[PDB]
Amino acid sequence: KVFERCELARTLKRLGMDGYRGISLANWMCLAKWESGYNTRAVNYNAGDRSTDYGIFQINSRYWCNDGKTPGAVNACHLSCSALLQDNIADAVACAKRVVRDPQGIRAWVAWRNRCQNRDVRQYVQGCGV
């Protein structure tokens, strides 16, 4: 599923993402926009280290979900990576919350630093009613 901007914003708020571990809703929107273009079925294989990024938040298989083919991987979210490709983003959101509970927080995603950090991210939620 490819979410429309405001549809996703309202969904994330309902799932309790606004201010989770100090992260504003607009930052989560900026992250999903740059990681997958708000696409839940996005999959990106990283030839360099044999890991794969899954879903709307492009969660990595080495630490967060299990896909069985990633060497020395752990499954911190206790989820099959398949769960992160569903149209319903409840599991992806629960796993994203787990990722940010680690010391790095939202910085765990390099795209966030490149495209969202220290920027005016209000644009991602303007007019959505959140």
Ligand code: NA
């Ligand atoms: Na894994």
